[PDB]
């Protein structure tokens, strides 16, 4: 029995709003709930102003909880895979590493000033994706209680938006692929047999990330085609029809979840 | 025996084990003990390869090791 790739699993960086040299790194399948636990309590600690935290960045797209924890622990250790400047440089170092490169992760910033420091790449550490929230926060004002609260509330809304949207997009895309399978008249791009659930090799399918592209195949067939120092996992294969770049991790995400 | 030769050998063992190959390109976690047992069963030479080298190979090949 295969385990599904998580709908969402991310490794996040928190920066205290008031204590701006305090950071925290963790990993989670639900960053909204997690940020409430960090800012309030774990379940229903004297306060020294470390809370509330701002979630300033999150790396997500991990193929498993295990992989996210590997990234988290490497990021915290600072690791065999190799100030705010150092925390952000560690992200780039890990995204360049052979192991995490296969995952085509997404680095998302909720704060534009933090994104700018990362981009400035002070240490010249420079397939992963980088994104920045619409209405990302910029310079933080922590001079008053109301300013601190305003930052916390706006940051929560940004984290909610990214998370709920990511889940809604995967939901929508799963439904569209399922409809393709359900028609039972698609055929495999490579072996030409009808696409139908009937043998893991026969029931795992691969789709183009463009839902209006008609490329569909057996996962095994796509794997074979893409794979023709030696490697095992495809890296940035292109759709044989529209030539767009695919993320193998996303291909597997939908493949396994449709079968389950 | 160079590390390149060992890595090629281990990769070739994986490619001859269909179930394990599919699990790896589907990013499925596997314990080191389970992996080494599957490899050794394809070629007993795996017995002579140290754990640290096997772990370097798993990192390079993107194999996810579950403790
Ligand atoms: Cl929630
Ligand atoms: Cl506190
Ligand atoms: Zn096929
Ligand atoms: Zn396509």
| Residue extents of the structural domains in chain A | 1-183, 184-260
Pairing relationship of beta strands A216-218 and A106-111 according to DSSP bridges: unpaired
Short-list A88, A110, A130, A103, CA closest to A6: A103
- The interface residues of chain A toward chain B in range 97-156, judged by CB-CB distance below 8 A, are 97-99, 101-103
A3 and B11 within 8 Å at the Cβ level: the answer is no
Is A197 strand, coil or helix?
coil
Measured from the alpha carbon of residue A238, the closest ligand is 4
Is A142 strand, coil or helix?
coil
The single-letter DSSP state of residue B14 is H
Sign of the dihedral defined by the CA atoms of residues A146, A151, A152, A153, in that order: positive
d(CA A59, CA A87): 13
d(CA A80, CA B17): 28
d(CA B7, CA B26): 20
Name the burial class of residue A229, with classes exposed (0-12), middle (13-18) and buried (19+) by CB atoms within 10 angstroms of its CB: exposed
Short-list A167, A165, A91, CA closest to A122: A91
Short-list A75, A72, A31, A69, CA closest to A53: A31
Residues near A25 by Cβ (< 8 Å), separated by ≥ 6?
A: A11, A12, A13, A14, A72, A75, A76, A87
Cα A254 to the chain's mean position, in Å?
A: 14
User: Within 13 Å, how many C-alpha atoms sit on residue A149's CB side?
Assistant: 3
Q: How far apart, in Å, do the first and last CA atoms of chain A sit? A: 10
Cα A216 to the chain's mean position, in Å?
A: 24
Residues near A170 by Cβ (< 8 Å), separated by ≥ 6?
A: A7, A253
With tokens 């569209």, the residue in question is A176
A232 and B12 within 8 Å at the Cβ level: the answer is no
Task: Establish if A3 touches chain B: CB-CB under 8 angstroms.
Answer: yes
CA of A136 to the centre of ligand 3 (A): 44
Distance from CA of B33 to the nearest CA of A (A): 16
Instruction: Name chain A contacts of B14, Cβ cutoff 8 Å.
Output: 232
Name the burial class of residue A163, with classes exposed (0-12), middle (13-18) and buried (19+) by CB atoms within 10 angstroms of its CB: buried
With tokens 């995204």, the residue in question is A95
With tokens 């008053």, the residue in question is A144
Is A136 strand, coil or helix?
strand
A229 and B25 within 8 Å at the Cβ level: the answer is no
Sign of the dihedral defined by the CA atoms of residues B6, B47, B62, A254, in that order: positive
What number of C-beta contacts closer than 8 Å exist between A and B?
71
Of A66, A97, A232, the CB nearest to B21: A232
The answer to whether A75 touches A38, Cβ cutoff 8 Å, is: no
The single-letter DSSP state of residue A51 is P
Chain A residue with CA closest to B10: the answer is A230
Segments forming the whole domain that contains residue B50: 1-67
């Amino acid at each position: 029995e295969f385990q599904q790739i998580p709908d969402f699993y991310g490794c996040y960086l928190l920066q205290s709003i008031s204590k701006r040299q305090s950071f925290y790194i963790g990993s989670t399948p639900n960053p909204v709930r997690r940020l409430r636990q960090h800012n309030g309590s774990l379940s229903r600690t004297k306060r020294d102003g470390t809370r509330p935290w701002e979630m300033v960045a999150i790396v997500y797209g991990f193929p498993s909880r295990i992989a996210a924890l590997q990234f988290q622990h490497a990021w915290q250790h600072g690791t065999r895979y190799i100030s705010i400047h150092h925390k952000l440089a560690m992200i780039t170092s890990l995204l360049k590493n052979e192991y995490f490169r296969y995952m085509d992760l997404t680095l998302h910033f909720f704060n534009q000033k933090v994104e700018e420091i990362w981009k400035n790449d002070k240490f010249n550490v420079s397939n992963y994706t980088v994104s920045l929230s619409q209405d990302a926060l910029t310079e933080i004002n922590n001079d008053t209680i109301d300013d601190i609260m305003d930052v916390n509330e706006k940051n929560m809304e940004l984290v909610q938006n990214l998370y709920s949207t990511t889940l809604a997009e995967k939901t929508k895309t799963l439904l569209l692929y399922k409809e393709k399978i359900d028609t039972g008249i698609n055929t495999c791009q490579f072996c030409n047999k009808i696409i139908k659930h009937n043998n893991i090799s026969e029931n795992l399918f691969a789709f183009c990330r463009d839902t209006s592209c008609t490329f569909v195949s057996h996962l095994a067939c796509a794997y074979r085609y893409f794979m023709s120092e030696d490697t095992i996992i495809p890296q940035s294969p292109k759709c044989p029809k529209c030539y767009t770049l695919l993320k193998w991790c996303d291909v597997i995400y939908y493949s396994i979840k449709l079968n389950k | 025996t160079s590390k390149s030769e060992v890595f090629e050998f281990l990769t070739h063992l994986v490619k001859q084990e269909p179930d394990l190959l599919t699990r790896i390109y589907c990013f499925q976690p596997i314990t080191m003990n389970d992996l080494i047992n599957k490899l050794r069963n394809k070629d007993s030479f795996v017995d002579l390869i140290d754990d640290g080298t096997i772990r370097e190979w798993t990192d390079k090949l993107g194999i996810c090791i579950r403790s």
